[PDB]
């Protein structure tokens, strides 16, 4: 069952075996993935997070981010450790109390301390729209239509050896899948449909790293939502989904009653489907309980291409229709060397005092904010353009901006910008060498907003900056509760800082 919008959420350690290999994990709600948090557009969420963690190998502190929610006036509840809060210490709790005006769609939540979400603290977050403009396109939209894609590691995140390549051990679809090596025939997830019905499938990448080529044998998929933004209908037969992205698609259960493979091929780790890796099962009601016998095509006829997506609403693009046609045009120099990422020559290392607290304490320009060189001020009520030219090792990098969604004026693998009707989203692949993926947004949300690669291993290696949007108005716009004010002193005491 779905929980929320007002709920407790316990964070605990437990052993799990989603691919037949047992290891300890960091879990929300006792499960991997965590339980779906849900409500309606405009609701007040009050998620009281109880930190009950005791195993230091996966960190006993935590902080939770509500990915894609704008947090306007509630920057303190956004979750990124050392940006908007100090972590919650073990044996304590914290009420993330916020509202979701003007948003409806598919989101997710995850730890935002170190690489802890990789150890299991990840789950779906759905904001339903009682007056959804896409409602007539489908018959079913509920917990049974959520599809999560996750990477899973046998080695604990904190224990990944310095200097060795990090790859996953399994792909998990709805929490189940088979290991790439020493594959055993552990249970696969089943997604059940009834012949003739239409389903709003909510596809959520909760990945720490790989992108997936997602498809369903025999079926096609009509995209209706991108990262919370309603789209015009776009029919595709494969979706390349990057870490932290979401799509909703209509699945028409219009094939013969049977079993069909659901495929999610990561860009690293096990290649193909031998032994049922990278797989789940779409089962029609009345089908035999047995594995599918279907195959994929050699070549997909209609893969998703991002420039084919367009908003359902007339969203346009802010600013003027040319490069640099913004109030604050930025071009970030994104680089990697010697194990560390950098943005404009600075590798991100989290500060001791959270950025928001530094601002509330009176730091009022970005040159006064720590970490030095990692915080960039943005002016209020302005059009911002950010160019994110690719080339840094480890790509393609899915960049994500907190506090905002943005127009994707230029997408991967295509040198032509779109100043008319590009999709808006919150996580975008910056592509490959020579690309110039570029985003635009307007600054109407005061506070410090993280911008980073959502490959969690790259964030940990410094691939981030903070946009301190409207520093002068941050304090007035974001009143803080006493419980938030108490986080830093409690954390610093517990850690002898
Ligand atoms: C990506 O686009 C940005 C503009 O959005 C380009 O930035 C220009 O860079 C040149 C030097 O390369 C400067 O002289 C300009 O001041 C920049 N701003 C402009 C033209 O608006 C950037 O070069 C592009 N990068 C790639 C790799 O194509
Ligand atoms: C590369 O991106 C451009 C810009 O988004 C795409 O160009 C648009 O193509 C559509 C469909 O033909 C036209 O309606 C638009 O007028 C084009 N816009 C512009 C600014 O050119 C283009 O299709 C993409 N290339 C590929 C191969 O998908
Ligand atoms: Cl966000
Ligand atoms: Cu996220
Ligand atoms: Cu986010
Ligand atoms: Cu990256
Ligand atoms: Cu983040």
Distance 417 CA to ligand 2 centre (A): 8
| Shortest-distance ligand to the CA of residue 329 | 1
Distance 331 CA to ligand 2 centre (A): 23
Cα–chain center distance at 298: 30
CB 257 within 8 A of CB 193: no
Tokens of 89: 């210490």
CB atoms closer than 10 angstroms to residue 152: 26
Closest CA to 179 of 287, 302, 278, 300: 278
Ligand 1: does its nearest atom lie under 6 Å from the Cβ of 353? no
Closest CA to 96 of 82, 117, 78: 78
Distance 2 CA to ligand 6 centre (A): 32
Owner of token pair 């693009």:
317
Please give, one letter per residue, the 3-state secondary structure of the chain.
Answer: CCECCEEEEEEEEEEECCCCCCEEEEEECCECCCCCEEEECCCEEEEEEEECCCCHHHCCCECEEEECCCCCCCHHHCCCECCCECCECCCCEEEEEEECCCCCEEEEEEECCCCHHHHCCEEEEEEECCCCCCHHHCCECCHHHEEEEEEECCCCHHHCCCCCCCCCCEEEECCECCECCCCCCCCCCEEEECCCCEEEEEEEECCCCCCEEEEECCCCEEEEEECCEEEEEEEECEEEECCCCEEEEEEECCCCCCEEEEEEEECCCCCCCHHHCCEEEEEECCCCCCCCCCCCCCCCCCECCHHHCCECCCCCCCCCCCCCCCCEEEECCEEEECCEEEECCECCCCCCCCHHHHHHCCCCCHHHCCCCCCEEEECCCCEEEEECCCCCCCCCCEEEECCCCEEEEECCCCCCCCCCCCCEECEEECCCCCCCCEEEEECCCCEEEEEEECCHHHHHCCCEEEEEECHHHHHHHCCCCHHHHCHHHHHHHHCCC
Sign, CA dihedral 278-240-233-453, equals positive
- How do 464-469 and 229-236 pair as beta strands? unpaired
Nearest residue (by CA) to ligand 1, atom 23, is 331
Choosing from 306, 410, 418 the residue with most ligand 2 atoms within 8 A of its CB, the one to mutate for a pocket test is: 418
Ligand 2: does its nearest atom lie under 6 Å from the Cβ of 307? yes
Ligand 2: does its nearest atom lie under 6 Å from the Cβ of 438? no
CB 304 within 8 A of CB 240: yes
Owner of token pair 């870490």:
243
Owner of token pair 């720590």:
370
Distance 426 CA to ligand 5 centre (A): 8
Tokens of 372: 């030095």
Number of the ligand 1 atom closest to the C-alpha atom of 322: 21
CB atoms closer than 10 angstroms to residue 154: 15
Ligand 2: does its nearest atom lie under 6 Å from the Cβ of 418? yes
Ligand 1: does its nearest atom lie under 6 Å from the Cβ of 323? yes
CA–CA gap between residue 88 and residue 109 (Å, rounded)? 16
Please report how many Cα atoms fall inside a 13 Å half-sphere around the Cα of residue 334, on the Cβ side: 33
Nearest 10 degrees: Cα torsion 473, 474, 476, 482: -170
Question: Around ion ligand 5, which residues have CB less than 5 A away?
Answer: 67, 402
Buried b (16+ CB within 10 A) or exposed e, 281-300: bbbbeebeeeebebebeeee
Domains in the chain, please, with CATH? 1-133 (2.60.40.420), 134-313 (2.60.40.420), 314-497 (2.60.40.420)
Owner of token pair 């899948």:
177
Rounded to a whole number of angstroms, the CA Rg of the chain reads 22
CA–CA gap between residue 460 and residue 121 (Å, rounded)? 16
Number of the ligand 1 atom closest to the C-alpha atom of 438: 5
What CA–CA distances, in Å, run from 132 to 137, 248, 249, 302?
A: 10, 13, 14, 27
Owner of token pair 């509920």:
142
Tokens of 382: 């302005």
Residues marked as catalytic: 65, 67, 110, 112, 397, 400, 402, 452-455, 458, 463
């Amino acid at each position: 069952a779905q929980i929320g919008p007002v709920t407790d959420l316990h964070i605990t350690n437990a052993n799990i075996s989603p691919d037949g290999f047992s290891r300890p994990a960091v879990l929300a709600g006792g499960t991997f993935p965590g339980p779906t948090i849900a409500g309606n557009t405009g609701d007040n969420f009050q998620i009281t997070v109880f930190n009950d963690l005791t195993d230091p190998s996966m960190l006993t502190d935590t902080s939770i981010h509500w990915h894609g929610l704008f947090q306007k006036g509630t920057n303190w509840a956004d979750g990124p450790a050392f940006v908007t809060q100090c972590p919650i210490i073990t044996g304590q709790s914290f009420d993330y109390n916020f509202n979701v005006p003007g948003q409806a769609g598919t989101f997710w939540y995850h730890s935002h301390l170190s690489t802890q979400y990789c150890d299991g603290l990840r789950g779906p977050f759905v904001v339903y729209d009682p007056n959804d403009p896409n409602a007539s396109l489908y018959d079913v939209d509920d917990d049974t239509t959520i599809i999560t894609l996750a990477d899973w590691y046998h080695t604990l995140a904190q224990q990944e050896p310095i200097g060795a390549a990090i790859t996953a051990d399994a792909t998990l679809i709805n929490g189940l899948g088979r290991s790439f090596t020493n594959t055993t025939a552990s249970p696969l997830s089943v997604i059940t449909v009834q012949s003739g019905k239409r389903y709003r499938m909510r596809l959520v990448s909760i990945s720490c790293d790989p992108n997936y080529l997602f498809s369903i044998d025999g079926h096609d998929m009509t995209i209706i939502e991108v990262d919370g933004v309603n789209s015009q209908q776009l029919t595709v037969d494969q979706i390349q989904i990057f870490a932290a992205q979401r799509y909703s698609f209509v699945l028409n259960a219009n094939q013969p009653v049977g079993n069909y493979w659901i495929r999610a091929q990561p860009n690293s780790g096990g290649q193909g489907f031998d032994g049922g890796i990278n797989s789940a099962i779409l089962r029609y009601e009345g089908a035999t309980v047995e594995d599918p016998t279907t195959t994929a095509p050699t070549t997909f006829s209609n893969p998703l291409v991002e420039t084919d997506l367009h908003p359902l609403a007339d969203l346009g693009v802010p600013g003027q229709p040319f490069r640099g046609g913004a109030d604050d045009p930025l071009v970030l120099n994104l680089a990697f060397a010697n194990g560390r990422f950098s943005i404009d020559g600075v590798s991100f290392v989290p500060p001791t005092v959270p950025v928001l607290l530094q601002i509330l304490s009176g730091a009022q320009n970005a040159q006064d904010l720590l970490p030095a060189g990692s915080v960039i001020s943005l002016p209020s009520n302005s059009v911002i353009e950010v160019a994110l030219p690719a080339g840094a090792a480890g790509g393609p990098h899915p960049f994500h901006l907190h506090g905002h969604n943005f127009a994707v004026v230029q997408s991967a693998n295509n040198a032509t910008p779109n100043y008319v009707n590009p999709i808006w989203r919150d996580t975008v692949s910056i592509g490959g060498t020579g690309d110039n993926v570029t985003i635009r947004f307007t600054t109407n949300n005061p506070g410090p907003w993280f911008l980073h690669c959502h490959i969690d291993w790259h964030l940990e290696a410094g691939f981030a900056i903070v946009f301190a949007e409207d520093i002068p108005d941050t304090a007035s716009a974001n009143p803080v509760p006493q419980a938030w004010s108490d986080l830093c002193p409690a954390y610093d005491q517990a850690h002898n800082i």
